[PDB]
Design a protein around this ligand. Structure first.
Ligand SMILES: *[C@@H]1O[C@H](CO)[C@@H](O[C@@H]2O[C@H](CO)[C@@H](O[C@@H]3O[C@H](CO[C@H]4O[C@H](CO)[C@@H](O)[C@H](O)[C@@H]4O)[C@@H](O)[C@H](O[C@H]4O[C@H](CO)[C@@H](O)[C@H](O)[C@@H]4O)[C@@H]3O)[C@H](O)[C@H]2NC(C)=O)[C@H](O)[C@H]1NC(C)=O
Ligand SMILES: *[C@@H]1O[C@H](CO)[C@@H](O[C@@H]2O[C@H](CO)[C@@H](O[C@@H]3O[C@H](CO)[C@@H](O)[C@H](O)[C@@H]3O)[C@H](O)[C@H]2NC(C)=O)[C@H](O)[C@H]1NC(C)=O
Ligand SMILES: *[C@@H]1O[C@H](CO)[C@@H](O[C@@H]2O[C@H](CO)[C@@H](O[C@@H]3O[C@H](CO)[C@@H](O)[C@H](O)[C@@H]3O)[C@H](O)[C@H]2NC(C)=O)[C@H](O)[C@H]1NC(C)=O
Ligand SMILES: *[C@@H]1O[C@H](CO)[C@@H](O[C@@H]2O[C@H](CO)[C@@H](O[C@@H]3O[C@H](CO)[C@@H](O)[C@H](O)[C@@H]3O)[C@H](O)[C@H]2NC(C)=O)[C@H](O)[C@H]1NC(C)=O
Ligand SMILES: *[C@@H]1O[C@H](CO)[C@@H](O[C@@H]2O[C@H](CO)[C@@H](O[C@@H]3O[C@H](CO)[C@@H](O)[C@H](O)[C@@H]3O)[C@H](O)[C@H]2NC(C)=O)[C@H](O)[C@H]1NC(C)=O
Ligand SMILES: *[C@@H]1O[C@H](CO)[C@@H](O[C@@H]2O[C@H](CO)[C@@H](O[C@@H]3O[C@H](CO)[C@@H](O)[C@H](O)[C@@H]3O)[C@H](O)[C@H]2NC(C)=O)[C@H](O)[C@H]1NC(C)=O
Ligand SMILES: *[C@@H]1O[C@H](CO)[C@@H](O[C@@H]2O[C@H](CO)[C@@H](O[C@@H]3O[C@H](CO)[C@@H](O)[C@H](O)[C@@H]3O)[C@H](O)[C@H]2NC(C)=O)[C@H](O)[C@H]1NC(C)=O
Ligand SMILES: *[C@@H]1O[C@H](CO)[C@@H](O[C@@H]2O[C@H](CO)[C@@H](O[C@@H]3O[C@H](CO)[C@@H](O)[C@H](O)[C@@H]3O)[C@H](O)[C@H]2NC(C)=O)[C@H](O)[C@H]1NC(C)=O
Ligand SMILES: *[C@@H]1O[C@H](CO)[C@@H](O[C@@H]2O[C@H](CO)[C@@H](O[C@@H]3O[C@H](CO)[C@@H](O)[C@H](O)[C@@H]3O)[C@H](O)[C@H]2NC(C)=O)[C@H](O)[C@H]1NC(C)=O
Ligand SMILES: *[C@@H]1O[C@H](CO)[C@@H](O[C@@H]2O[C@H](CO)[C@@H](O[C@@H]3O[C@H](CO)[C@@H](O)[C@H](O)[C@@H]3O)[C@H](O)[C@H]2NC(C)=O)[C@H](O)[C@H]1NC(C)=O
Ligand SMILES: *[C@@H]1O[C@H](CO)[C@@H](O[C@@H]2O[C@H](CO)[C@@H](O)[C@H](O)[C@H]2NC(C)=O)[C@H](O)[C@H]1NC(C)=O
Ligand SMILES: *[C@@H]1O[C@H](CO)[C@@H](O)[C@H](O)[C@H]1NC(C)=O
Ligand SMILES: *[C@@H]1O[C@H](CO)[C@@H](O)[C@H](O)[C@H]1NC(C)=O
Ligand SMILES: *[C@@H]1O[C@H](CO)[C@@H](O)[C@H](O)[C@H]1NC(C)=O
Ligand SMILES: *[C@@H]1O[C@H](CO)[C@@H](O)[C@H](O)[C@H]1NC(C)=O
Lengths: 314, 189, 213, 49, 49, 97, 49
């Protein structure tokens, strides 16, 4: 639900402390200004992409004193205050697997990992005890088992089934969580989707930097090696040729970033929908909140993304 | 001339010229190496032609500068943010004017506070929290408030939301005994 | 005798310091597993022919008695034009570029040339005083210069050239300004090898120490 | 009227957006850098004339 | 030069002097030499003729 | 180029040389057109996404009663009405709370 | 739910049967290679769709 908030200093990139270059850059008008706004626009979108997904609850709730609800463990989903950290056990696992003369940098997000974690914690706490109106209005405290009974009714299972088999259900639930922990802990394919976004970002920046060494038919890729041995006539011709090349490399980069940003937006939009329908309530549509008949789900914080745990009846 | 270290200088070595900051280093140079490069094709360090000392070259601090303002129809005021800069260098180069651009009428007062975003000067830092109006970064936002009858730009930690709590039981339940009808709006292009 | 180059003939292409990185480039390197020509000095048989340079060669020698003393690089290989003699003179390394009247079969006496005229370059190094030692060299022509790399390792081989990998370090860049198309080895059992360099693309692995591993 | 784009940070923004009126918020108006001081020149010892 | 007859000007100025033949070549923009540097310098711009 | 104005090149400058100046100016300008249209296509794609959503909401919020939470408003959806707007659609979402 | 998996040899397209062209193409480094990869990365998702 995000990508790096990159930023490029147009003048630094094109004209490596060259006065003659700068003069030959001004002649191209608003070139740098246009690029700057485009990148700024993206950075702004990256911020919204996060807020629109996580900030679903107007009230922050305190972590329940006891995490044990009707036999349901929950301990690996919620933060544990005993430790100095503010994340859940699962989240810690998730977060363990995912100047320069080039004028390139990156800006920080508004919401830090701790702030995001706080939101997820509130949502989980809500889910566990706030009932069905958690995201609709005032929270309404309800016994967990009763909440589950309702969910089963929605599935198409007669209420009594839950209660009669409550012990087995709670046990299976707790087991499934432990199973996931092991799967996550010992895998390498897990948040491959998030790593992919990161890898592609790096490639774009790497490519852009490499282009600075491009010759473009010039005597030399280095401005200093143009000025130092040439009379002003040819020197300007050579610089202009080098500038042309570099100007293109920037427009190319930004174009790709704009396209990339659009795809991230689409992902972020879906994430917001899933949280709304899968977490703050009980979706009925098929094959949307997991691979079975949806009961409930829990969000977890992740490095530039969102991880959902979908609990289904099969 | 003598080496001038730990500051931005204009250097000229026998084969390498440019500007930047010279610092000593422990790079394991071979008997047949004069200078080195970074992973990317930029000069990393140079061995001195006279004393055979190895010094690294760091870039002179640069970056984007942004201004934080309320509306001009409300008041005339501004705070200035220097992206990713240690405020120690920002202050130094204002007193020792070595900044581009420099303003005709400008000075640096006590309103200096550093955040992960960069060095923010002109805003008053507070130890409270509010709804984020103008986002800065890393949990920090700016807003314009009355501070013990004059309003000013302040720097604060944004609130995540309302602070509340509910009880849990295994034998009680909350049920609405009233309701209301409300109308909200939505706009799309 | 033809042998395999293994992974030998690698050298530091430039005086640039790097660390912990993979660097891809192209230069006159000895191709891996190339066809290497062996030469021998055994009993009555001594190989000391004139060998084509082809803009750069690989040289190695296995010694226990320092039979190989040097090389002669040039064109016509006589006093008609310039050639350079590079020898271990037993106390100093001596390099001279002149129009030399060379011995057709060169070797307590220095029998390399009878006369030298029109000398353009002279250099003398500081003084000094199974096979055991493997000496490795690379010779390249560039912008009138003869670029020379050197290396060395302990050995324990009788006739062959042991497989392995070793990066050589530069030693000379001689501003000779001469035409080198051919060369001859200068001899005092022992053996040596000659390969040819090619403009081949290599990926070089630089360790933390900045060395090539 | 006129705006001196070097007088203060406010002027820079006004010039940047080509307007005497600004509504609200945070804006990047330019880059910045520190200016180098003296010179450092170095050469090899021996001079063979 | 042909098209000078198609243009109007607010003024015409003319500079006059005597130089050595070989130095005539220095009377142009982007030139260096005794004349170009110390006697008669032209700006980086077009010159009429 | 000597001038951004085509006429100030073509009119006074010698027709041979003029082609050089003109060709350069043409290339310069063509680049801005390519940039402009590229951005417009991207912007258009974003509008499509919005339009698609609006169409969906019209059907599910106005012409029927949506049950999916927060789609037609925060509360429990009862009713909605569309309104005309300058290049957009404005909805009134009536909910039970 | 798909489009043709376009693939073009950027070397042949630009410098078809010309060494001199290629020699000059090299002055643009890996541009040709990067462009090729970028295209392949699109065809790759057609299978996914
Ligand atoms: C919800 O589900 C979770 C997951 O199962 C439960 O959490 C577990 O609770 C148990 C209760 O103590 C933890 O017990 C672990 O025991 C390990 C073994 O050593 C003890 O037992 C042996 C038995 O003979 C004794 O000999 C020995 O002296 C000890 O008494 C410990 O090694 C574990 O220590 C952990 O924390 C320390 C903290 O610094 C670490 O250094 C250790 O490496 C290790 O992490 C621990 O004591 C068990 O670990 C808990 N699991 C998790 C994942 O936390 C919940 O209790 C359950 N909730 C409810 C209400 O049932
Ligand atoms: C319907 O499916 C459920 C689970 O999918 C079945 O419940 C499981 O029944 C087996 C034995 O029939 C239980 O195994 C036993 O567990 C006890 C625990 O201490 C152990 O001591 C025994 O040796 C044995 O392992 C299993 O635990 C139980 N699963 C759960 C979650 O309780 C259920 O029996 C199925 N229905 C029918 C009619 O079989
Ligand atoms: C270039 O020539 C100069 C000659 O002045 C060499 O510089 C001199 O180097 C020495 C050794 O580092 C410097 O320190 C001196 O050490 C002796 C040791 O006993 C000590 O007695 C002296 O008081 C002093 O400490 C010496 O100051 C230095 N001179 C200057 C002016 O810097 C320089 O090393 C030569 N360069 C090369 C590459 O040889
Ligand atoms: C902005 O710059 C100032 C000045 O350099 C930074 O303050 C200095 O921070 C270092 C820690 O990195 C402090 O400890 C020093 O550590 C080195 C490590 O070898 C040690 O050799 C020194 O003796 C010292 O212990 C240093 O005391 C501190 N300077 C002062 C005057 O407090 C400051 O942290 C920088 N701000 C940011 C955000 O980086
Ligand atoms: C349903 O019952 C719960 C539990 O009693 C009510 O929540 C609790 O209500 C009390 C009184 O309004 C809250 O204030 C408490 O007052 C005592 C007075 O001495 C004070 O000692 C406590 O420290 C506290 O101030 C209490 O905070 C509140 N607890 C929670 C978690 O909200 C709840 O309001 C009842 N709901 C209805 C509709 O009656
Ligand atoms: C809801 O969960 C709470 C969890 O604290 C239950 O409260 C606890 O209920 C037990 C049984 O009524 C109380 O008595 C305890 O009995 C055991 C029997 O061996 C004894 O060892 C304990 O010392 C204690 O006497 C216990 O005091 C009580 N805890 C508190 C804090 O009140 C509550 O009953 C549950 N409600 C329902 C409807 O299940
Ligand atoms: C849910 O809460 C609302 C709160 O507005 C209740 O509606 C209000 O009910 C009162 C009593 O029936 C209505 O009459 C009021 O009586 C007082 C008596 O002195 C008078 O001063 C007021 O001016 C007014 O007449 C009041 O109008 C009504 N609110 C509105 C907007 O009509 C509602 O009945 C509650 N629902 C349930 C099921 O309890
Ligand atoms: C390189 O140096 C050798 C010196 O050995 C030159 O070869 C020699 O050239 C002379 C002249 O043609 C040959 O004839 C000699 O003439 C003198 C005249 O008085 C006579 O006294 C000698 O007895 C002899 O006849 C001489 O035989 C010949 N040397 C040999 C071994 O054939 C050679 O020409 C020089 N190369 C160049 C390119 O200058
Ligand atoms: C093999 O190497 C030895 C040692 O370098 C050569 O013998 C040496 O030849 C030089 C003349 O070139 C003799 O005189 C020296 O001249 C330098 C000039 O600056 C002077 O500094 C020295 O003190 C000395 O006067 C030198 O004495 C002589 N040394 C010996 C041991 O003979 C020899 O000629 C070389 N052989 C060949 C074939 O080149
Ligand atoms: C290339 O980098 C390696 C780094 O591993 C350098 O090798 C290491 O050099 C140290 C210093 O001689 C060796 O001794 C060590 O001393 C410390 C002192 O407290 C001691 O704690 C260590 O146990 C060890 O004795 C160290 O063994 C050595 N490492 C290896 C693998 O040889 C190496 O010198 C660098 N190369 C060059 C040319 O500098
Ligand atoms: C020494 O070398 C020089 C050149 O480095 C020789 O002079 C050249 O001789 C050729 C013979 O045809 C002429 O074509 C060149 O024009 C000559 N160059 C110059 C600068 O004169 C010289 O003859 C050589 N001397 C000896 C004894 O061989
Ligand atoms: C904007 O200008 C009008 C002009 O009268 C003024 O009344 C209004 O209060 C101004 N807005 C603010 C926020 O001050
Ligand atoms: C020696 O040269 C001959 C020439 O044909 C060749 O056949 C033979 O194999 C060579 N010796 C070795 C060991 O290769
Ligand atoms: C390399 O030497 C072997 C020795 O038998 C020979 O067969 C082979 O053809 C040679 N390769 C080339 C390219 O000459
Ligand atoms: C070296 O000699 C060969 C012999 O034909 C000649 O063709 C070549 O051009 C010469 N090279 C130089 C640099 O003189």
């Amino acid at each position: 639900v995000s990508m790096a908030k990159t930023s490029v200093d147009c003048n630094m990139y094109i004209c490596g402390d060259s006065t003659e270059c700068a003069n030959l850059l001004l002649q191209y008008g608003s070139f740098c200004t246009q690029l700057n706004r485009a990148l700024s626009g993206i950075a702004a979108e990256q911020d919204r992409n996060t807020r629109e997904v996580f900030a679903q609850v107007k009230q922050m709730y305190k972590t329940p004193t006891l995490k044990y609800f009707g036999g349901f463990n929950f301990s690996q989903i919620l933060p544990d205050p005993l430790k100095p950290t503010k994340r859940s056990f699962i989240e810690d696992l998730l977060f363990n697997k995912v100047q320069k003369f080039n004028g390139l940098t990156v800006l920080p997000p508004l919401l830090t990992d701790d702030m995001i974690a706080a939101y997820t914690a509130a949502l989980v706490s809500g889910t566990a005890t706030a009932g069905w109106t958690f995201g609709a209005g005032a929270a309404l405290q309800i016994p967990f088992a009763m909440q589950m009974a309702y969910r089963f009714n929605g599935i198409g299972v007669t209420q009594n089934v839950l209660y009669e088999n409550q012990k087995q259900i709670a046990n299976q639930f707790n087991k499934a969580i432990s199973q996931i922990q092991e799967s996550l802990t010992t895998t390498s394919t897990a948040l491959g989707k998030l790593q992919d976004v990161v890898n592609q970002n790096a490639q774009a920046l790497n490519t852009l930097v490499k282009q600075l060494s491009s010759n473009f038919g010039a005597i030399s890729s280095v401005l200093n090696d143009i000025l130092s041995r040439l009379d002003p006539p040819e020197a300007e011709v050579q610089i202009d040729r080098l500038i042309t090349g570099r100007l293109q490399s920037l427009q190319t980069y930004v174009t790709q970033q704009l396209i990339r940003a659009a795809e991230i937006r689409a992902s972020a939009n879906l994430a917001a929908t899933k949280m709304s329908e899968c977490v703050l309530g009980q979706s009925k549509r098929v094959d949307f909140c997991g691979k079975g008949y949806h009961l409930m789900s829990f969000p977890q914080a992740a490095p530039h993304g969102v991880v959902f745990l979908h609990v289904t009846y099969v | 001339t003598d080496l001038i270290k730990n500051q931005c200088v204009n250097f000229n070595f026998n084969g390498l010229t440019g500007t930047g900051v010279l610092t000593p280093s422990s790079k394991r140079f071979q008997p047949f190496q004069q200078f080195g490069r970074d992973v990317s094709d930029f000069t990393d360090s140079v061995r001195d032609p006279k004393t055979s000392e190895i010094l690294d070259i760091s870039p002179c601090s640069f970056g984007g500068v942004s201004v934080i303002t309320p509306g001009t129809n409300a008041s005339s005021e501004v705070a200035v943010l220097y992206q990713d800069v240690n405020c120690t260098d920002v202050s130094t180069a204002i007193h020792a004017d070595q900044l581009t651009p420099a303003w005709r009428i400008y000075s640096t007062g006590n309103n200096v506070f550093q955040t992960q975003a960069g060095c923010l000067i002109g805003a008053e830092h507070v130890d409270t929290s509010y709804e984020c109006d103008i986002p800065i970064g890393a949990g920090i936002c700016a807003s314009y408030h009355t501070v013990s009858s004059q309003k000013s730009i302040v720097a604060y930690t944004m609130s995540l939301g309302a602070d509340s709590s509910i009880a849990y039981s295994n034998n009680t339940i909350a049920i609405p005994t009233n309701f209301s009808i409300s109308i909200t709006t939505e706009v799309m292009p | 005798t033809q042998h395999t180059s293994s992974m030998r003939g690698v050298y530091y292409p430039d005086e640039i310091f790097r660390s912990d990185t993979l660097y891809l480039t192209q230069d006159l390197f000895l191709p891996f597993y190339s066809n290497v020509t062996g030469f021998h000095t055994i009993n009555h048989t001594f190989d000391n022919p004139v060998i084509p340079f082809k803009d750069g060669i690989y040289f190695a020698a296995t010694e226990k008695s320092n039979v190989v003393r040097g090389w002669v690089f040039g064109s016509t290989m006589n006093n008609k034009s310039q050639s350079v003699i590079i020898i271990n003179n037993s106390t100093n390394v001596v390099i001279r570029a002149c129009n030399f009247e060379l011995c057709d079969n060169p070797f307590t006496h220095t029998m390399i040339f009878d006369n030298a005229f029109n000398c353009t370059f002279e250099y003398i190094s500081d003084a000094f005083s199974n096979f055991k030692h493997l000496r490795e060299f690379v010779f390249k022509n560039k912008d009138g210069f003869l670029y020379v790399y050197k290396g060395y390792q302990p050995i324990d081989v009788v006739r062959d050239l042991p497989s392995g990998f070793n990066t050589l370090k530069p030693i000379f860049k001689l501003p000779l300004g001469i035409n080198i198309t051919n060369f001859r080895a200068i001899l005092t059992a022992a053996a040596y090898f000659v390969g040819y360099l090619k403009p081949t693309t290599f990926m070089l692995k630089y360790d933390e120490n900045g060395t090539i591993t | 009227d006129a705006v001196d784009c070097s007088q203060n940070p406010l002027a820079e923004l006004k010039c940047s957006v080509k307007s005497f009126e600004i509504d609200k918020g945070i804006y990047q108006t330019s880059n910045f850098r520190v200016v180098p001081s003296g010179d450092v020149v170095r050469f090899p010892n021996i001079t063979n004339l | 030069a042909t098209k000078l007859n198609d243009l109007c000007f607010s003024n015409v100025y003319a500079d006059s002097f005597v130089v050595k033949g070989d130095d005539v070549r220095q009377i142009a923009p982007g030139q260096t030499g005794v004349i170009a540097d110390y006697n008669y310098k032209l700006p980086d711009d077009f010159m009429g003729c």
